[PDB]
Nucleic acid binder design. Structure first.
Lengths: 111, 44, 24, 116
RNA sequence: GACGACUGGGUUGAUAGGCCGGAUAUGGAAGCCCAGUGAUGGGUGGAGUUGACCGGUACUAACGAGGGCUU
RNA sequence: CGGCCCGUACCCUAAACCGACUCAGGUGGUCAGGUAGAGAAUACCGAGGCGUUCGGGUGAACUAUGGUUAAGGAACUCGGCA
RNA sequence: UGCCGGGUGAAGCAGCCGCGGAAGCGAGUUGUGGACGGUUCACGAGUGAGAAUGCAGGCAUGAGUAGCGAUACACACGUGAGAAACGUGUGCGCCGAUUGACUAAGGGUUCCUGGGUCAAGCUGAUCUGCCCAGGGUAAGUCGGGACCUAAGGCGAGGCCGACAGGCGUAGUCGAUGGACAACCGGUUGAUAUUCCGGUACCCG
RNA sequence: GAGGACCGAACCCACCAGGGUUGAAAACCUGGGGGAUGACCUGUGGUUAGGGGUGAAAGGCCAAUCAAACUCCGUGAU
RNA sequence: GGAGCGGAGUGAAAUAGUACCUGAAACCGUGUGCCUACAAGCCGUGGGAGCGUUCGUGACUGC
């Protein structure tokens, strides 16, 4: 019953996103929302916003309204287009700073 | 401390100005060789 | 000090595994 | 109350005194405030001591409370509205409840209120 | 005790705070009265304030077995 | 009755100028209150302004800026450097 | 140049199965791809890279590490999808020969209103000196020009110099100086010695 | 009531120490320190240009570069 | 909230979606077969048991 959504170009570094997505692999869909709800990390907000699209797609598109037999089948974060800007530092030099992005994908399947 | 560029428009038009470039024939070559190279701002 | 060599993939990943969040 | 180990709240010993004094001002003004967990723990013994002094009620104690809360209006309510309420209760005048972490700096917050 | 960790307690509860008392520390509160032209002094009174030390007191907050085989 | 042209916003001991930066630096001149004090020093205030430009805790070693040290008093050190 | 292939799927890329003594090959095959290739004999070469502290682009390691740029903010309410940072109120602290109010130089629209939160802000943002649209600077008396000249510059003729060019007279420019007539109060979101009110002054 | 006079803020400077040293800063910060009516400091406008300028003289300074600046050209120098 | 995405639709083709023909390598992930916590390793090579969606891995041992 694989239904999935994903957010692309989400402005949070891939490692910081993986820190949270590695909690929500293979648990009940609702039980995963109740974990991202009470999660200190700031990446848990975009991730839970994608976890809700997956359930919304499962209910609407494929007519699996009951969102309690679902578990996270797949969830992974892919690298995204990095932005590059500079920073003035001591003695006239400049060090680069990369503002990384990520592509978060979540897949819910029936148990 | 005090850096090596204190802007002053008056003193930058009496030194690199167009009127000054047209006074010395050595300076009119600078103007002409910038016209031929195609620059937009032809003199300071 | 400065890194003497590029850290091998095995050694890099041994460490980043330790940078994990805890289930609430 | 016993002093704090380690770094003082607000970055200085002077700031701490005025910080805890004004928090007590607000707690008596509204009866309940939401603030950082560490600040709530420091504020409990200070506020409870002030209530103890207000229970006695005499002019001398009113000076003593005034050394901490410079506001005469707040002290009036403390001696004439709050202290009568706690006439019978022997201590433990404040209740501390933990809430979720704050957004932005993930500081653990808490509610401290006067026990009804 | 850097953080983990270690130790004790978790309503069958004195773990911490508060509240009562002590011990300590300073050293004679505020108000009132008396004396003095005044600065000040005397009485009420080893007073008032007071943290960590001490005794009381519930008022506040307390994943993990089903035993391999051979001799 | 006529009296022309340019400037007139905004910043200016600075987040808008010169330093590549919202940079602990530099930037001519004018205004200049109260109390103590000789004073434009210094302490607290006025007119007026600021608290936004990463935070919350936690008594580790250690580093830096401050503070106090019994008895001795340069015995330290190249040197009373601090 | 002769002979051939191609929407019945060419080049290129990724495999699988075979082949050669090497550089390598397959008119074998599969997937991707979607319009150009194979081969005989010759002919030409910007014809083969792993190193030059080589050059350009992308991406790693150091590492979720150092730093986040000099003293204090707290609470209540509000807006809001979301608030430690945005608004309002209260309190507390700091500057105050200045963390206040102006001006020249410089900058050049950063000023005001409304809207936005993708890029920027060493976090955050509903906020911004950011982005978009619109608006805003009023002079007979303020500063300067139409008045004067200093240091100095240019310079008709002119002198000197092979050429280029150097100097300089009359003159003409050149404020940082001289001469010259307006003060108080009010107003807008943004301007005021400029507009408005009162009373003045100067030249024709 | 004179002074290249005395003490001492502004202003100019940089003797000592600590910090900073991939810094807040390609020369600064903190506390002391020197001059502080003069050979002083400073604004505006001028002016001296490379084997040359200027220099109370250190080969110092001449746009973060000076025992001979910088740019283009000879030039693909050797 | 938006961004973005899942269905749907256009298209011959939507991992051709205005970040867009082809889409290599470095680099980053998910799943999966094997090995790996008494071991000294220019990380390969010869011998070799075992396990498994000739092939993949490689206990142990020689160089």
């Amino acid at each position: 019953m694989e239904a999935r959504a994903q957010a692309r170009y989400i402005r949070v570094t891939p490692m910081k996103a993986r820190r949270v997505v590695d909690l929500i692999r293979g648990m009940d869909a609702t039980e995963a929302q109740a974990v991202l709800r009470f999660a200190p990390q700031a990446a848990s907000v975009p991730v839970k916003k994608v976890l809700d699209s997956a359930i919304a797609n499962a209910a609407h598109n494929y007519d699996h309204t009951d969102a309690s037999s679902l578990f996270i089948s797949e969830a992974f974060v892919d690298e995204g287009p990095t932005l590059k800007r500079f920073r003035p530092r001591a003695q006239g030099r400049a060090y680069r700073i990369r503002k990384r992005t990520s592509h978060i994908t979540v897949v819910v399947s029936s148990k | 401390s005090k850096r090596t560029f204190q802007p002053n428009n008056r003193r930058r038009a009496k030194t690199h100005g167009f009127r000054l470039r047209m006074r010395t024939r050595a300076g009119r070559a600078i103007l002409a060789t910038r016209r031929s190279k195609g620059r937009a701002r032809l003199s300071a | 000090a400065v890194p003497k060599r590029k850290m091998s993939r095995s050694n890099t990943r041994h460490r980043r595994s330790q940078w994990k969040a805890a289930v609430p | 109350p016993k002093p704090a180990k380690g770094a003082r709240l607000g970055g200085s010993a002077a700031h701490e005194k005025l910080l805890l004094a004004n928090l007590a001002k607000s707690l008596f003004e509204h009866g309940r405030i939401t603030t950082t967990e560490a600040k709530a723990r420091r504020l409990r013994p200070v506020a409870e001591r002030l209530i103890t002094k207000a229970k006695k009620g005499d002019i001398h104690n009113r000076r003593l409370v005034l050394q901490t809360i410079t506001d005469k209006g707040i002290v009036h309510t403390l001696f004439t509205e709050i202290a009568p309420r706690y006439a019978e209760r022997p201590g433990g005048y404040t209740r501390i409840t933990k809430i979720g972490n704050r957004r932005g700096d993930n500081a653990p917050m808490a509610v401290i209120e006067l026990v009804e």
